[PDB]
Amino acid sequence: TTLLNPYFGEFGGMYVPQILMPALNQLEEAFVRAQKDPEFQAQFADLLKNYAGRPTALTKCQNITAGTRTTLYLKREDLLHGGAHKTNQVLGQALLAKRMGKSEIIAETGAGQHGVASALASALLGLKCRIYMGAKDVERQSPNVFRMRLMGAEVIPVHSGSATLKDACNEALRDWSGSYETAHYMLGTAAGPHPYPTIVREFQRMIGEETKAQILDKEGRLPDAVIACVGGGSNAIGMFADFINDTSVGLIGVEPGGHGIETGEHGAPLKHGRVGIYFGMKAPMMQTADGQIEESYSISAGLDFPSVGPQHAYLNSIGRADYVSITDDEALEAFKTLCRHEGIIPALESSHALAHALKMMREQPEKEQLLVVNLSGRGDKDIFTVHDILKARG
Amino acid sequence: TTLLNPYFGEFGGMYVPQILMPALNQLEEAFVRAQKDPEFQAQFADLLKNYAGRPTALTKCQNITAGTRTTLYLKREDLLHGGAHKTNQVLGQALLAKRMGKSEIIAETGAGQHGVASALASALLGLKCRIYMGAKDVERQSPNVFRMRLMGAEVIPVHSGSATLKDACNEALRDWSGSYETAHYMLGTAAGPHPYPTIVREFQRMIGEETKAQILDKEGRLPDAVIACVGGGSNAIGMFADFINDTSVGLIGVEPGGHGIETGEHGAPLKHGRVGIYFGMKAPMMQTADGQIEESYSISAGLDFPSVGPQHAYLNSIGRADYVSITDDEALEAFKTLCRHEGIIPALESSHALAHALKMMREQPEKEQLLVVNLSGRGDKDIFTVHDILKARG
Amino acid sequence: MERYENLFAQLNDRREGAFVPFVTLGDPGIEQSLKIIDTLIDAGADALELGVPFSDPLADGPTIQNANLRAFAAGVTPAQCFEMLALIREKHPTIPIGLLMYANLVFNNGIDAFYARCEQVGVDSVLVADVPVEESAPFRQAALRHNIAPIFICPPNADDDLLRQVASYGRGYTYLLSRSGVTGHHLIEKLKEYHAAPALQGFGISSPEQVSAAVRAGAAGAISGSAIVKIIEKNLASPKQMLAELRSFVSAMKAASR
Amino acid sequence: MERYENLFAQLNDRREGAFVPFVTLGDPGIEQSLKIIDTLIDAGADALELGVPFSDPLADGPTIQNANLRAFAAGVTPAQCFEMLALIREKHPTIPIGLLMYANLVFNNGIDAFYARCEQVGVDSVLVADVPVEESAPFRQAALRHNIAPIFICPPNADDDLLRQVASYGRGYTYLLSRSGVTGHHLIEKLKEYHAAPALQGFGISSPEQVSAAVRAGAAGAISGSAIVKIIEKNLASPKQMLAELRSFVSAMKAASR
């Protein structure tokens, strides 16, 4: 069996070829032991603090909420080394790999952010890193590809399937099934086979823990709701985790609505997909009526995971967390608004979370509410995307 | 007269048209009062902490120093909001502008970083911001120009002169000489007419103060030397300030050597220029034998200021600080090295400082030395520049 | 199940192993695929392992990755695969037919319904590539309810516990992995000790000597996929030549099992 | 200095103000510039304000910014400017000649040496645009040592303290700024009360009525630069027409001072 429950209600599991089970079992055992090891926690804390830059600020956004009864704070993961929350968990996973005596790292990446995060962690900790990326993604993310290579990582294009994230995910697993003896698979989100959903949550948990301590210090109470975008679910569960037992705190996950849910061109499997079994887990996903896996569309490349973390599907099913969607245009508007009113350029991914917060505020201007938006990353990387769009509109 | 000494030895002064003296006098008085105002200090500290992300980490770089007796720490200004140290002082200056009752901001920019910093500070604090940038710089820094505009700043190209930084500097002064009544000139470095060299130093002083507290905590002693790149001198004086009276601590400023000092294509006026009077101050500068002002060349656009802060010229003259130069190739090598060995992409500006530190280590591998390099900013902005260069070499 | 029992019983009386080729249904097209399958059978195939085209075959190497892609280029759907399976069964009443599936295609319209469809079409076993014994319960139960053999995988590092599980839960045949990775001796004795279904070695089997070695080691037979698929891929422009090569390869591999 | 004293003494006996045009030496070329200057004098200019081309004229508007640029396009250097000045002096013995300088050009080869060069060439005053009274010491001292009048600027917001300093340190004439910004009544009385050098109003003076107004207000005269330079810029293609227009404009401005 396993040490921890691989399921969150009906979602999760370990749907990988038999050959990979020993790898998952080893990882789970190493994780459980690491969690009880004061030395591991100390090293991880050291890296988070002195290398990554934790704790991150909790910024009160006074301008954007003017004229309303909403008080909005932004958890600044955009200020974390690397420019996104991904850095937190790759550092923990890299340490786990070393705890298991592994010297190589395998990672998958779509937009390229996880690839960059995996590469920097591997460079710092002396791990040989090889990254799999969809061919179409390699072509469209030249900047991130060059960054990975500058940091010594090996970038491998994947031309199979749709040549995107899910395809890179497959290639990663194919490789690991034959090299797990010396290589660790650094999965990029709170999804995939157990123990990844659990490990990634625990290695992103400081986001929520810090937010709780900071909001209590600044406001003397917990927020009415914490809001986060949901691509795969890591930054969201990272923010949610420490508040799960604080029943008065709303947990709101925001999936990308793309051109609009009714257009079929979106990335909201949790609320508009259908439960299936893929990427080693049972979870809602983007799939055809026949069961073939489809891609997730969003103006934001980072919210392209065609499925969603099992724990999110679970929290939704029991009504502990609520999930909504935000379209390309709503995210773009939030992006423009934060730049102009707070002088912060948010990642288009994070802009989805901000957009919903803005909607909560604008739809009910006189409702007194204390909101925290997880600003998962910075958007310097999205200025061209936003630029091209705006110009094409006159 | 003035409240503070406008000179650092023979360097400095207030060489501006008579019409601008009242503006300088007002600013000096507002600064002096602000420095004694607990409320101003509290607001500034609040912004630095909760908005900008201070304190910044002090990262020990173990990999890069392997095999030597050098212990190297990097002061992480690259993790500051905006990606560079410039953010610190623009926040202070923005507060000063508001203290004086000004509602508009005028700024000059070359590489565009100061323009971006000025724009974000102005967006946050509700100031109308207009930025002057050399036409050739506007053309070559499309990303930064778009960022400024996204944050509500007005960007104005300058086609006069060489259409670069110094030209933007002139246009800024021309504008201010006729609008100082309601506009504050947010100068971008520790140079120009008094009180700017002093104000900028004091508003960047936390870099050195934090570094001192952090190194004392981690090593139990002061560093043997603190190293920083010198474009205009702000990040360097920011790092140096709190250590000036600690005579055992070496202060090393690194000017850009470009293609090599002997080629004449460099940006090292302090050690290879000649003292002159321009941009409101008496300081060493890049100038022809006739006294015409020349441009500073460096692979790094940010080290393009054709002169240098008066206090640096002074510290050099009395032997308190030492200044050296680093060529394009040496900076490029340090850039590649940090990416690969520490997983940190440094700004090409900062790479000059790192390069000299690497030289101190490599030339005398068995010399026991505790060094701190001011990592003034991140280099995500330089990946294309570095990319194009490397490819053109096979 | 039934058909596997009879096959192995017959093969045992003739002291020979089984040769089982694998091919993706619909590759390179429905018509050509049906011909390929008839060729494989006529050439000596004792049983068949047939894959249903899936968007993300995360357990297959490039060769089979392309087989799925070619099938998709032909518009082959799971429904058409079941139509093909019914026909294959109507043509060949005794040959064991095993499907190589990926979990989502089995789970899609209901696990029980999938195995029910397998039974009405004449399928004998189903191997779900991404379902380890740990997650097998619903699948093996549905399989057994519809007289379908649930195929379990015995990896090269399989410990005693796994061997015992594979032995008790599996039916039809035990899949003996030749190695780790994707498609492209002591355990055999342990499996027999635990009354496991006859072992069929698979992965990397591409030559007659490998088939003879498998049988010598005690395996009931060997499975070959990529080697078969490569022949299809290399003769896409020549359908007739494709069948010719397939027949020559299958007859060679089968002869080695005797 | 000397020449200014005589000029204002003479102008006073004729109850008229002085009209002083400004032009950049070498704009658009050395030869044409010398002709422009002779035209200005022949047309009625009482004194001249001459700029030495500088790379960064941070106190000048676009019009003069371009004058400097045109001069540089002609390769005009400070040394050539001094050659021009010597010639202008050799041709016109009594007209006061004032230079408009930027600090670096004065400081470049030594402040004392610069004023020494001014004296040997026949220059009468020097106004360093970016040197406020606060930094004037070395400049005004060097000027006085070589019988050169150091020109001080009296801004529109000048307080009593500044007025007193400008009055005691200045010589030749006091520069009365018409406004803040760059190139493109009560103070007059205070200056006279403090025995300041005769006031010349400058900045924005582009029409005859402005010259008459300046004199009426009590100023000793008015300076006009951009208005003069614009004429040069608009007639670059027609040298002869350029001189014609300059003569017509200067004669008009001078007539207004009578």
Ligand SMILES: O=P(O)(O)OCCNS(=O)(=O)c1ccc2ccccc2c1
């Ligand atoms: O000759 P090859 O190409 O090496 O292998 C042929 C694969 N076909 S197969 O036997 O239908 C087959 C396919 C994939 C699998 C993944 C995990 C468990 C078992 C599997 C069985």
Ligand SMILES: O=P(O)(O)OCCNS(=O)(=O)c1ccc2ccccc2c1
């Ligand atoms: O008619 P305009 O173009 O407005 O002004 C003509 C400027 N020429 S000038 O008088 O030689 C002149 C030029 C620039 C100055 C800057 C600061 C102090 C005084 C100055 C005097």
Ligand SMILES: *Cc1c(COP(=O)(O)O)cnc(C)c1O
């Ligand atoms: C990767 C990324 C995301 C999406 O992934 P999650 O695992 O859902 O957090 C969101 N925001 C940013 C800035 C990212 O880089």
Ligand SMILES: *Cc1c(COP(=O)(O)O)cnc(C)c1O
């Ligand atoms: C602006 C900049 C510099 C150069 O300016 P100083 O005023 O000399 O500090 C150096 N590093 C970075 C990252 C900069 O953005």
Ligand code: NA
């Ligand atoms: Na998703």
Ligand code: NA
């Ligand atoms: Na410089």
